[PDB]
Amino acid sequence: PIVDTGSVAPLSAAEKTKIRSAWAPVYSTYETSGVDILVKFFTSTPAAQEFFPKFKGLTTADQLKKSADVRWHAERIINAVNDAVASMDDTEKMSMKLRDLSGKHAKSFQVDPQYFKVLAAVIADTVAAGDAGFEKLMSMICILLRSAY
Amino acid sequence: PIVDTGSVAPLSAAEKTKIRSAWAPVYSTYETSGVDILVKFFTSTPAAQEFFPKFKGLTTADQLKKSADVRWHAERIINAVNDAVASMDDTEKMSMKLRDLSGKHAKSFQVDPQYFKVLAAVIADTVAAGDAGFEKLMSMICILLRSAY
Ligand code: HEM
Ligand code: HEM
């Protein structure tokens, strides 16, 4: 399961390879994947909706997929994950970028840190449901995303 | 015409209104608009191509529209303009964000500052060809984008 506290063991060359494979297809059409992942997370997790101000009024999954605000937010989130995937070999660069992002979530967007893993899970199901390796990569991302809180 | 030096007169309430109108449709489907604007700029301005490292190998306009790298870069650029459009009433906020962006272009991406206006022109043709008001908004953006150089 995905964790957002403590530490997780490094990624093995084997795990990185599977991740890159499962990711390629999804990121290949990130504009669609991203929106589905975000629309899914948003609709099924009511408690977290108050944190998407620009989505006020939107409710049906159909309205969301059409809002340019939703698409932009999804494209940015989905590309952040991609940056992480592209940096599995430079864990130092991966950290700097995410810690920076952590700060923005805590100081500006003011989002409750508990949902990072909830959304991470949706991304995991969609990309490679069941793969522990990918779950490990999402854990690193969640742990770093909470580093500024 | 669009300028990237000196200063330009403030935007009148009348100009801001036309801008918001011409922009709404374009930004409404920014993922497509952005890619066309960028693909157009890139293909017709060979001299500036060396500054898009992630596009090495890409040549036909068809290849570009399919690359995820091109789409992401276009979506980011097109949204930067949108941020500016959304801030015409808070020229102070508009400056901070752009100056920051100026620094990135000069210190990291290392892009030749002369093309800002060339691309700004393509964005102007597409959005509201001929409108001086919109050209004024693009000038503010180019002047600020060169402030770090
Ligand atoms: C793996 C999880 C997540 C990733 C990788 C992620 C990534 C990002 C990225 C890259 C941005 C763009 C920031 C910028 O424009 O500078 C962003 C913005 C934002 N994120 Fe997160 N995010 C995550 C989870 C969440 C969650 C769970 C929430 C809400 C419960 C959230 C709420 C926001 C908000 C409110 C913004 C600001 C959007 C705006 O006003 O334009 N994020 N996030
Ligand atoms: C109105 C004009 C322009 C705007 C508003 C604009 C906006 C942006 C934005 C918002 C980014 C994202 C930066 C980030 O990821 O933090 C960016 C990246 C970039 N821009 Fe500009 N840009 C403009 C013109 C240009 C021009 C003319 C060139 C090249 C001749 C250029 C080359 C780059 C490069 C190389 C990147 C880095 C892309 C990457 O490696 O991910 N930009 N620009």
Give the domain CATH number at A106: 1.10.490.10
Distance from CA of B147 to the nearest CA of A (A): 24
Query: Could you please report the per-residue DSSP string of A2-60?
Result: ---SS--PPPPHHHHHHHHHHHHHHHHTHHHHHHHHHHHHHHH-GGGGGG-GGGTT--S
Cα–Cα distance, A46 to B132 (Å, whole number): 45
Ligand nearest to the CA of B143: 2
Cα–Cα distance, A100 to A95 (Å, whole number): 8
Query: Does the annotation flag A73 for ligand binding?
Result: yes
DSSP three-state, residue B55: helix
Which ligand 2 atom sits closest to the C-alpha of B81? 5
Q: Which domain holds residue A55?
A: 1-149
Residues 34-93 of A with CB under 8 A from B: 68, 71-72, 75, 79
Tell me which residue has tokens 């408690």: A47
One-letter identity of residue B114: Q
**At a CB cut-off of 8 Å and minimum separation 6, what does A39 contact?**
A61, A64, A65, A70, A74
Domain count within chain A? 1
* Elucidation technique: X-ray
Distances (CA, A) of B45 to A81, B88, B116: 32, 29, 12
Query: Does the annotation flag A39 for ligand binding?
Result: no
Cα–Cα distance, B115 to B117 (Å, whole number): 5
Angstrom resolution of this structure? 2.9
